[PDB]
Amino acid sequence: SPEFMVKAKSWTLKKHFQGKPTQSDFELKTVELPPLKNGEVLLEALFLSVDPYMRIASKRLKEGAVMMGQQVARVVESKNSAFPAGSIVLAQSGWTTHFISDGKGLEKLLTEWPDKLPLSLALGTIGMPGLTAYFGLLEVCGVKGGETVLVSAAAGAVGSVVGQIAKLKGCKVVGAAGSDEKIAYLKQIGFDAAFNYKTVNSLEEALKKASPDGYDCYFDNVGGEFLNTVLSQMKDFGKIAICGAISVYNRMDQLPPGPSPESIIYKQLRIEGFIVYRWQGDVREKALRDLMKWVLEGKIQYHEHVTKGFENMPAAFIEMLNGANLGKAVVTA
């Protein structure tokens, strides 16, 4: 009988980003949630993800609207038999502490989830970033064993998974990241070579040392000038998997000088863009099962860059874009 009010705090986009996003570009809001109707569920955020795509997606957002994003949430109350109270779901509810859903876009976490594995992994290694790495490496680059893979943003969510999957498939992997701490971490988890792209004397020389015979596949997470230099190091018929281009996300209106036609033509390179969502159904489930299996087998180690508290979400996002994160950037409510 007793009814208790549920307050939902949400992070809104106060002002569109100009260059690097800043705290002031965000505005916290609180709203009293209405009662649950039949077929609806009340969700309470447990772990919220901040991702690079939010920098671009925020452009199609009207100022004042809630920032987009996925989170792991617990069903606190339920009037929907498919999502019982207490169950855990993945929801594209945006940056909010509580959310009422009719169950439409909700995704149940992988069945038989191990107690030892934090639920937040469903937002990284055993989630979208991990799936991105899986399909970009295995399908787009199509590695079969013995090839040499280069991966940028190597100590990041996607990058760290790419390198480890490449290693378990029997490939040689070289990684590029932005800090000495990250480089040490990469060598710890199996990367054959790794270098701090910020402190190189020569990007080209760094790549040459890492792999003298060149690269079979380049999993591109950064684009820009880095991509331009990588093309000269690709093996003939090499493949470039265009996953993202974070180096230009803050300057989409001032794109740097483009790639050289010389390398693309003479080396007959294949460049392909892809989005995780191209893979669905059974193939997507098998990928999740594989990622889970590989984590349980110790083949894919992980690390989460946790930011405590919902009120610190803008900071977690900003800092992730700036490279503060080693592994998946996750925010605990």
Ligand X SMILES: NC(=O)c1ccc[n+]([C@@H]2O[C@H](COP(=O)([O-])OP(=O)(O)OC[C@H]3O[C@@H](n4cnc5c(N)ncnc54)[C@H](OP(=O)(O)O)[C@@H]3O)[C@@H](O)[C@H]2O)c1
21, 118, 178, 314: residue in contact with ligand X (rule CB under 6 A) = 178
d(CA 281, CA 131): 13
Residue 197's identity, in one-letter code, is Y
Helix 128-135 vs helix 281-296: angle between axes, to the nearest 10 degrees? Answer: 100
Which residue type does 224 have? G
| CA 57 – CA 171 distance, rounded (Å) | 34
**Least distance between ligand X and beta carbon 263 (Å):** 13
Strand residue runs (E) in 79-223: 88-91, 98-101, 107-108, 148-151, 172-177, 193-196, 215-220
Any known ligand binding at 245?
Answer: yes
Give the range of 16-24, 48-56, 98-106, 209-217 binding ligand X by CB under 6 A: 48-56
* Residue 312 sits in the site that holds Cl ion (CB under 5 A): no
With binding defined as CB under 8 A, does residue 228 bind a copy of itself?
yes
Site string for ligand X, 147-176 (x = CB under 6 A): ------x-xxxxx-----------------
C-alpha pair distances (Å), 260 with each of 197, 244, 251: 20, 19, 20
Q: How many CA atoms lie within 13 A of 161 on its CB side?
A: 30
Which of residues 126, 137, 217, 246 is near ligand X by CB under 6 A?
A: 246
SS3 category, 298: coil
Q: Which is nearer to ligand X, 21 or 178 (CB)?
A: 178
For residue 226, what is the enclosing H or E element? helix 224-230
Annotated binding site for NADP(+): 156-159, 182, 197, 221, 243-249, 274-276, 325
Q: Which residues are annotated as a binding site?
A: 156-159, 182, 197, 221, 243-249, 274-276, 325
* Residues near Cl ion (CB under 5 A): 16-17, 58-59, 319, 322, 324
- Residues in contact with ligand X by the rule CB under 6 A: 51-53, 129, 132, 153, 155-159, 177-179, 182, 221-222, 243-244, 246-247, 265, 274-276, 320-321, 323, 325, 329
